[PDB]
Design an enzyme around this catalytic site. Structure first.
Site, short mmCIF file in Angstrom:
data_model
loop_
_atom_site.label_atom_id
_atom_site.label_comp_id
_atom_site.label_asym_id
_atom_site.label_seq_id
_atom_site.Cartn_x
_atom_site.Cartn_y
_atom_site.Cartn_z
N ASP A 199 35.08 52.50 35.92
CA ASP A 199 35.30 53.75 35.20
C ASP A 199 34.57 53.69 33.89
O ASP A 199 34.39 52.61 33.30
CB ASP A 199 36.80 53.91 34.93
N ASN B 128 42.00 43.33 32.88
CA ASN B 128 41.50 42.62 31.70
C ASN B 128 41.23 41.19 32.06
O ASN B 128 40.67 40.45 31.30
CB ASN B 128 42.46 42.69 30.52
N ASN C 52 37.33 46.94 29.14
CA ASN C 52 38.05 45.67 29.09
C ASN C 52 37.92 44.83 30.35
O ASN C 52 38.16 43.63 30.26
CB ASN C 52 39.53 45.86 28.74
N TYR D 89 44.44 41.90 37.66
CA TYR D 89 44.59 42.98 36.64
C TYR D 89 43.25 43.15 35.91
O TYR D 89 42.45 42.16 35.82
CB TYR D 89 45.83 42.79 35.69
N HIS E 268 41.37 54.34 35.88
CA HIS E 268 40.97 52.97 35.65
C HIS E 268 40.60 52.26 37.00
O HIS E 268 39.95 51.20 36.99
CB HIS E 268 42.07 52.16 34.89
N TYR F 9 49.01 51.88 40.34
CA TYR F 9 47.68 51.98 39.70
C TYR F 9 46.60 52.66 40.57
O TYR F 9 45.59 53.11 40.02
CB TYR F 9 47.17 50.66 39.16
#
Length: 193
Positions: free
Chosen positions: A95, A70, A116, A68, A22, A17
């Site tokens: 972002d 969310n 999110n 993570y 993101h 990631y």
């Protein structure tokens, strides 16, 4: 107006990631930490990676949730409650789909705007924290949004974003010194060279 004393960068954990759009918030907070020699350490108690140190004469906490995206609130909420940091003293880098690479804005208040990570945080501390919106572009359509935020940007777009990030970095002094209107004007005025 409150000094910024807690700066959070939103993103996902893991090396698959790290370079995805993101993780724009992580890029900003990581570069900030090293700029000032603040060490980011595993902080399992608050489900994140965190540090603290001197930034331009102020004691500032840095936080990267490891929940993570969310679930970012599970790290942000108890951390800022535990240190009794008011939302007005918090800056959250993230972002922003709705702005193009090389566009960057400081905003106070408002909702999550579809984001999110912010969605998991506004419910619990309210909307009164500052956000550094790092434009990542919009990919065209709703179906593509997800593979866009979770994808790596091409070189040209990455430079634009890195330029925008270098500029906000050079304005953190104003933020930690409580000069928020001034920071906002100077961050919001950025356009690539």
């Amino acid at each position: 107006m409150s000094n910024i004393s807690l700066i959070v960068g939103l993103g996902n954990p893991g090396s698959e990631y790290a370079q995805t759009r993101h993780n724009a918030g992580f890029w900003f907070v990581e570069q900030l930490a090293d700029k000032y020699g603040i060490t980011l350490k595993n902080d399992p108690k608050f489900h994140g990676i965190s540090g603290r140190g001197n930034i331009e004469g102020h004691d500032v906490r840095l936080l990267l949730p490891m929940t993570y995206m969310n679930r970012s609130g599970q790290s942000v909420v108890p951390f800022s409650k535990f240190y009794q940091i008011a939302p007005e003293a918090i800056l959250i880098a993230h972002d922003e789909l709705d702005m193009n690479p090389g566009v960057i804005r400081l905003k106070t208040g408002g909702g999550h705007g579809g984001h999110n990570g912010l969605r998991d945080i506004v419910p619990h501390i309210g909307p009164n924290f500052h956000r550094l919106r790092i434009g990542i572009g919009h990919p065209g359509s709703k179906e593509r949004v997800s593979g866009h935020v979770l994808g790596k940007a091409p070189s040209n777009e990455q430079s634009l974003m890195d330029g925008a990030i270098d500029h906000a970095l050079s304005k953190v002094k104003l933020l930690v010194q409580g000069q928020v209107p001034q920071a906002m004007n100077q961050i919001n005025a950025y356009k690539p060279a």
